[PDB]
Motif scaffolding. Structure first.
Motif, PDB file in Angstrom:
ATOM      1  N   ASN A  29       7.081   4.207  -1.991  1.00 60.04           N
ATOM      2  CA  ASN A  29       7.413   3.156  -1.029  1.00 60.04           C
ATOM      3  C   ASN A  29       7.154   1.798  -1.672  1.00 60.04           C
ATOM      4  O   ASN A  29       6.128   1.614  -2.344  1.00 60.04           O
ATOM      5  CB  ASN A  29       6.570   3.288   0.240  1.00 60.04           C
ATOM      6  CG  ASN A  29       7.041   4.421   1.136  1.00 60.04           C
ATOM      7  OD1 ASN A  29       8.228   4.764   1.150  1.00 60.04           O
ATOM      8  ND2 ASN A  29       6.113   5.017   1.878  1.00 60.04           N
ATOM      9  N   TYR A  31       6.863  -2.457  -1.219  1.00 59.28           N
ATOM     10  CA  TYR A  31       6.553  -3.499  -0.252  1.00 59.28           C
ATOM     11  C   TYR A  31       6.591  -4.882  -0.890  1.00 59.28           C
ATOM     12  O   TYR A  31       6.283  -5.030  -2.078  1.00 59.28           O
ATOM     13  CB  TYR A  31       5.170  -3.264   0.335  1.00 59.28           C
ATOM     14  CG  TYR A  31       5.064  -1.910   1.007  1.00 59.28           C
ATOM     15  CD1 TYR A  31       4.719  -0.765   0.272  1.00 59.28           C
ATOM     16  CD2 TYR A  31       5.357  -1.773   2.364  1.00 59.28           C
ATOM     17  CE1 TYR A  31       4.636   0.484   0.890  1.00 59.28           C
ATOM     18  CE2 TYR A  31       5.283  -0.529   2.997  1.00 59.28           C
ATOM     19  CZ  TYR A  31       4.921   0.591   2.252  1.00 59.28           C
ATOM     20  OH  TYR A  31       4.850   1.808   2.897  1.00 59.28           O
ATOM     21  N   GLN A  32       6.946  -5.888  -0.090  1.00 63.15           N
ATOM     22  CA  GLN A  32       6.992  -7.277  -0.557  1.00 63.15           C
ATOM     23  C   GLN A  32       5.614  -7.716  -1.061  1.00 63.15           C
ATOM     24  O   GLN A  32       4.577  -7.369  -0.476  1.00 63.15           O
ATOM     25  CB  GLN A  32       7.504  -8.206   0.563  1.00 63.15           C
ATOM     26  CG  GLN A  32       7.670  -9.701   0.173  1.00 63.15           C
ATOM     27  CD  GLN A  32       6.377 -10.523   0.223  1.00 63.15           C
ATOM     28  OE1 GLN A  32       5.522 -10.331   1.092  1.00 63.15           O
ATOM     29  NE2 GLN A  32       6.235 -11.453  -0.720  1.00 63.15           N
ATOM     30  N   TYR A  33       5.611  -8.454  -2.171  1.00 63.78           N
ATOM     31  CA  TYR A  33       4.409  -9.071  -2.726  1.00 63.78           C
ATOM     32  C   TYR A  33       4.802 -10.389  -3.395  1.00 63.78           C
ATOM     33  O   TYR A  33       5.740 -10.416  -4.169  1.00 63.78           O
ATOM     34  CB  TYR A  33       3.677  -8.162  -3.726  1.00 63.78           C
ATOM     35  CG  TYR A  33       2.298  -8.716  -4.012  1.00 63.78           C
ATOM     36  CD1 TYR A  33       1.200  -8.376  -3.218  1.00 63.78           C
ATOM     37  CD2 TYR A  33       2.105  -9.629  -5.055  1.00 63.78           C
ATOM     38  CE1 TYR A  33      -0.057  -8.924  -3.468  1.00 63.78           C
ATOM     39  CE2 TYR A  33       0.871 -10.175  -5.316  1.00 63.78           C
ATOM     40  CZ  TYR A  33      -0.210  -9.820  -4.517  1.00 63.78           C
ATOM     41  OH  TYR A  33      -1.430 -10.382  -4.784  1.00 63.78           O
ATOM     42  N   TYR A  51      -1.094  -3.486   2.480  1.00 60.64           N
ATOM     43  CA  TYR A  51       0.221  -3.644   1.852  1.00 60.64           C
ATOM     44  C   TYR A  51       1.377  -3.289   2.778  1.00 60.64           C
ATOM     45  O   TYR A  51       2.430  -3.910   2.714  1.00 60.64           O
ATOM     46  CB  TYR A  51       0.322  -2.818   0.564  1.00 60.64           C
ATOM     47  CG  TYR A  51       0.104  -1.328   0.744  1.00 60.64           C
ATOM     48  CD1 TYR A  51       1.176  -0.458   1.028  1.00 60.64           C
ATOM     49  CD2 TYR A  51      -1.168  -0.781   0.608  1.00 60.64           C
ATOM     50  CE1 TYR A  51       0.977   0.917   1.199  1.00 60.64           C
ATOM     51  CE2 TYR A  51      -1.382   0.588   0.779  1.00 60.64           C
ATOM     52  CZ  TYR A  51      -0.315   1.426   1.054  1.00 60.64           C
ATOM     53  OH  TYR A  51      -0.575   2.763   1.206  1.00 60.64           O
ATOM     54  N   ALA A  52       1.174  -2.296   3.645  1.00 63.06           N
ATOM     55  CA  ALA A  52       2.249  -1.789   4.498  1.00 63.06           C
ATOM     56  C   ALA A  52       2.530  -2.687   5.706  1.00 63.06           C
ATOM     57  O   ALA A  52       3.466  -2.431   6.461  1.00 63.06           O
ATOM     58  CB  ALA A  52       1.950  -0.340   4.936  1.00 63.06           C
ATOM     59  N   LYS A  54       3.209  -5.826   5.129  1.00 62.44           N
ATOM     60  CA  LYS A  54       4.268  -6.692   4.586  1.00 62.44           C
ATOM     61  C   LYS A  54       5.602  -5.953   4.674  1.00 62.44           C
ATOM     62  O   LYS A  54       5.624  -4.769   5.006  1.00 62.44           O
ATOM     63  CB  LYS A  54       3.966  -7.114   3.143  1.00 62.44           C
ATOM     64  CG  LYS A  54       2.540  -7.626   2.873  1.00 62.44           C
ATOM     65  CD  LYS A  54       2.136  -8.793   3.746  1.00 62.44           C
ATOM     66  CE  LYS A  54       0.883  -9.488   3.217  1.00 62.44           C
ATOM     67  NZ  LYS A  54       1.201 -10.344   2.026  1.00 62.44           N
ATOM     68  N   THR A  55       6.711  -6.634   4.383  1.00 62.96           N
ATOM     69  CA  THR A  55       8.041  -6.046   4.518  1.00 62.96           C
ATOM     70  C   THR A  55       8.228  -4.873   3.565  1.00 62.96           C
ATOM     71  O   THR A  55       7.966  -4.995   2.362  1.00 62.96           O
ATOM     72  CB  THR A  55       9.152  -7.094   4.279  1.00 62.96           C
ATOM     73  OG1 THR A  55       9.011  -8.150   5.233  1.00 62.96           O
ATOM     74  CG2 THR A  55      10.538  -6.477   4.416  1.00 62.96           C
ATOM     75  N   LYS A  56       8.667  -3.746   4.127  1.00 61.51           N
ATOM     76  CA  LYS A  56       9.030  -2.594   3.315  1.00 61.51           C
ATOM     77  C   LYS A  56      10.417  -2.835   2.752  1.00 61.51           C
ATOM     78  O   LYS A  56      11.347  -3.110   3.514  1.00 61.51           O
ATOM     79  CB  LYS A  56       9.008  -1.298   4.124  1.00 61.51           C
ATOM     80  CG  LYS A  56       9.313  -0.084   3.265  1.00 61.51           C
ATOM     81  CD  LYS A  56       9.190   1.183   4.064  1.00 61.51           C
ATOM     82  CE  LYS A  56       9.667   2.367   3.280  1.00 61.51           C
ATOM     83  NZ  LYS A  56       9.559   3.573   4.146  1.00 61.51           N
ATOM     84  N   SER A  59      12.576   2.812  -0.657  1.00 64.25           N
ATOM     85  CA  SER A  59      11.803   3.933  -1.170  1.00 64.25           C
ATOM     86  C   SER A  59      12.644   4.812  -2.055  1.00 64.25           C
ATOM     87  O   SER A  59      13.868   4.762  -1.982  1.00 64.25           O
ATOM     88  CB  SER A  59      11.265   4.756  -0.001  1.00 64.25           C
ATOM     89  OG  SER A  59      12.323   5.289   0.765  1.00 64.25           O
ATOM     90  N   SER A 210       0.046  -2.960  -7.652  1.00 65.50           N
ATOM     91  CA  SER A 210       0.588  -4.289  -7.401  1.00 65.50           C
ATOM     92  C   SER A 210       0.709  -5.142  -8.666  1.00 65.50           C
ATOM     93  O   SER A 210      -0.115  -5.070  -9.589  1.00 65.50           O
ATOM     94  CB  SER A 210      -0.249  -5.016  -6.334  1.00 65.50           C
ATOM     95  OG  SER A 210       0.440  -6.168  -5.886  1.00 65.50           O
TER      96      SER A 210
END
Ligand code: CL
Ligand code: CL
Ligand code: GD
Length: 258
Positions: A29, A31-33, A51-52, A54-56, A59, A210
């Protein structure tokens, strides 16, 4: 005595026996960072579950090659090619390519992370699945290096809940490998964590990784009870199961006595 005594003070790592259709590989999965956010990924809560929130981004499933090696482009006199970090020099060039005209500090788009088109310069990903020990004994997981921040967790109610692989992350910060980027400075190479595992049980496994800028690196290995090392390609060791929240017997709290 007729039976083993069990690990002391219920110390065995929780494992699982999912009864559904086994699939090769781990789920990833994404996620945005934020680019150049060197603080968010320094927090345990963020790396365990935050982390989840934030925007997914998307996947990919069935991944058996789980190591990260992401190298930024060098826009060179002869074209654009990825630069090994150790080959970067000056301000800046890449050994064998000359000077690079592009910035080390912008986002870059690539499929280098598991074929998924995203920004490997700045992203968080969650790998989930189950580790199947073929041998009973001590397993030592390791990260050779970490660019930028990462955890690895093994066990029911540590990585995730048995038969509930696809669920929102659990809140456990009891990491098997803590490779969280420190606030002051960084951390050593070859950071390690050991788990005693019983053959033929499925151990939930979570890796959260990350990156904030430029190069991304996470060389994942495991040393087996026989002393041999499996690196990068975990084919034959890692599997996924679709959620089955109704499978009552799925959790094995103490495989040392099951
Ligand atoms: Cl490139
Ligand atoms: Cl050069
Ligand atoms: Gd980085």
């Amino acid at each position: 005595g007729l039976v083993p005594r069990g690990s002391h003070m219920s110390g065995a790592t929780e494992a699982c026996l999912p009864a559904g259709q086994r699939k090769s590989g781990m789920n990833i999965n994404f996620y945005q960072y934020s680019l150049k956010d060197s603080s968010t990924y320094s927090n345990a809560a963020y790396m365990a579950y935050g982390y989840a929130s934030k925007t997914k981004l998307g996947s990919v499933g069935g991944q058996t090659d789980i190591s990260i090696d992401y190298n930024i482009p060098c826009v060179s006199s002869s074209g654009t090619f990825p630069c090994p970090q150790e080959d970067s020099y000056g301000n800046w060039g890449c050994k064998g390519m000359g000077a690079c005209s592009n910035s080390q500090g912008i986002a870059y788009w690539s499929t280098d992370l598991f074929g998924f088109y995203t920004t490997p310069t700045n992203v968080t990903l969650e790998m989930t699945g189950y580790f199947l020990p073929p041998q009973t004994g001590s397993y030592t997981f390791s990260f050779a290096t970490v660019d930028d921040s990462a955890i690895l967790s093994v066990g029911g109610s540590i990585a995730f809940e048995c038969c509930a692989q696809e669920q929102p992350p659990i809140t456990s910060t009891n990491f098997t490998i803590n490779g969280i980027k420190p606030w002051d400075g960084s951390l050593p190479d070859n950071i390690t964590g050991t788990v005693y595992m019983y053959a033929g049980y499925y151990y939930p496994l979570k890796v959260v990784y990350s990156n904030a800028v430029s190069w991304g690196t996470l060389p994942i290995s495991v040393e087996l009870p026989d002393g041999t090392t499996v690196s990068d390609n975990f084919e034959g060791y890692v599997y996924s199961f679709d959620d089955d929240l109704s499978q009552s017997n799925c959790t094995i709290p103490d495989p040392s006595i099951h």
